[PDB]
Structure 1
């Protein structure tokens, strides 16, 4: 029992209502369980869902998430939930335009050099999906675009094995376009590191998934292509863990 096709605007109402909970919490500098949950709620709702990403931007979720970063510069887990939702937005190619914003990129480049890999990993992701889209869709500066490409690659190699799995994925599909961005190794580097990371932490879930969705061929494509050593290194490791 419910009221036909009336569930479409309840989830958009929900996004609107959680955003207000973020504002009222940021307003009060109240890093509490409720704020953390609301941030997690927003993250999961945007998962595999470009309509929710759009609603998040249509009500001013970027501006607000910016101001969230700024109000809680040392709260590692806050940042993570913020950047995680923002990684989902980085995935939607139509919304790429509305992330072309140096105040937003300046926040992401900052958190790329976090000593917490949990934080820096999601920053890296946002960067890789944005650099993935080529020089011609980067409406911002090319001194920053080239500089983040370098910082992204060098950052990944500073990363320890993390203790627990840091992220869940329902599908590996968004990674495949990054696997073929040979001109930008840091974008491929992030992709392979992450696949390796979830496949070593939770193979029972992710090896079957990676294989079924057609991942091996992309990985094999890297194995034989002049390619970046590090990217090729992680590449053959994942492969050999199955072949």
Structure 2
């Protein structure tokens, strides 16, 4: 039995709010312990593929909280990894785009994009890639930082070493729009790089998911677009032969 019809959504939003309260406590106590880490995990997991949870996170000031956990633990890469990963889930949500065009937010993650901890930088790139993908007038912040950041995104991915599981997906669908941003080649480079990674270390799961969800057509579409960035085109042909 349960409380009433529909009570499940109410208690998921309640759980989100209590987890955020724990995060706030821990940050206040400067206490990097196992339950803070598990709270960041649980939050990150609940935002997975749930626009509703991501909306709630925002509405309970979670973005300001996570800016503060980033400022209070600048040496804890596992922590920033969970923080930015959840924020990557949020940047995946189109109606939430305006919420992230905060100056201190974008500044902090443009800082973290240049970490050499790929575990950390991958999700900062995710955030920036999704954001820039929304187009020009959608960008309500400094036009010059948009133009800077897309180049830096491209450059920082190129420096990535091949990691030793950074991330897991149930679907590639949030990637496919990125794959078509020829105007902005770092967005694609992040997408194809992410795909190459997850396909390369758990192919049984991920190559299948990719094919079933119609990825081949998109990759291959980059292929015959004769005027694409050569870094992107190279990664995409690697991914294609992986299947083909």
Give, in whole Å, the separation in 1 of the partners of 2:193 and 2:9: 36
- By how many angstroms is 1:91 displaced? 0.4
Give, in whole Å, the separation in 1 of the partners of 2:13 and 2:82: 19
Spell out, residue by residue over 1:157-203, the C-alpha distance to the aligned partner (whole angstroms, 9 max, x if none): 0000101x210000000111000000000000000000000000100
Specify the alignment match of 1:119 in structure 2: 120
- By how many angstroms is 1:115 displaced? 1.1
- By how many angstroms is 1:5 displaced? 1.5
Give, in whole Å, the separation in 1 of the partners of 2:96 and 2:35: 28
- By how many angstroms is 1:25 displaced? 0.1
Say which SS state the counterpart of residue 75 (structure 2) adopts.
coil
- By how many angstroms is 1:53 displaced? 0.3
Specify the alignment match of 1:8 in structure 2: 9
Give, in whole Å, the separation in 2 of the partners of 1:171 and 1:118: 20
Spell out, residue by residue over 1:26-69, the C-alpha distance to the aligned partner (whole angstroms, 9 max, x if none): 00000000000000000000000011001001110000000000
Give, in whole Å, the separation in 2 of the partners of 1:237 and 1:223: 11
1:221 aligned onto 2:242: no
Aligned residues between the structures:
242
- By how many angstroms is 1:227 displaced? 0.8
- By how many angstroms is 1:118 displaced? 0.5
Give, in whole Å, the separation in 1 of the partners of 2:38 and 2:60: 19
Say which SS state the counterpart of residue 137 (structure 1) adopts.
coil
Map residues 97-108 of structure 1 onto 2, 5 A cutoff. Answer: 97-108=98-109
What's the TM-score once normalised by structure 1's chain length?
Answer: 0.99
Give, in whole Å, the separation in 2 of the partners of 1:130 and 1:233: 24
Q: Which runs of 4+ in 1 moved over 4 A?
A: none
- By how many angstroms is 1:8 displaced? 1.1
Say which SS state the counterpart of residue 135 (structure 1) adopts.
coil
Say which SS state the counterpart of residue 30 (structure 1) adopts.
coil
Give, in whole Å, the separation in 1 of the partners of 2:242 and 2:192: 13
What's the TM-score once normalised by structure 2's chain length?
Answer: 0.99
- By how many angstroms is 1:223 displaced? 0.6
Give, in whole Å, the separation in 1 of the partners of 2:47 and 2:2: 24
Say which SS state the counterpart of residue 7 (structure 1) adopts.
helix
Give, in whole Å, the separation in 1 of the partners of 2:153 and 2:101: 18
- By how many angstroms is 1:236 displaced? 0.2
Alignment RMSD: 0.5
Specify the alignment match of 2:50 in structure 1: 49
- By how many angstroms is 1:2 displaced? 1.1
Give, in whole Å, the separation in 1 of the partners of 2:211 and 2:63: 35
- By how many angstroms is 1:221 displaced? 0.6
Give, in whole Å, the separation in 2 of the partners of 1:134 and 1:5: 37
Give, in whole Å, the separation in 2 of the partners of 1:136 and 1:217: 29
- By how many angstroms is 1:224 displaced? 1.1
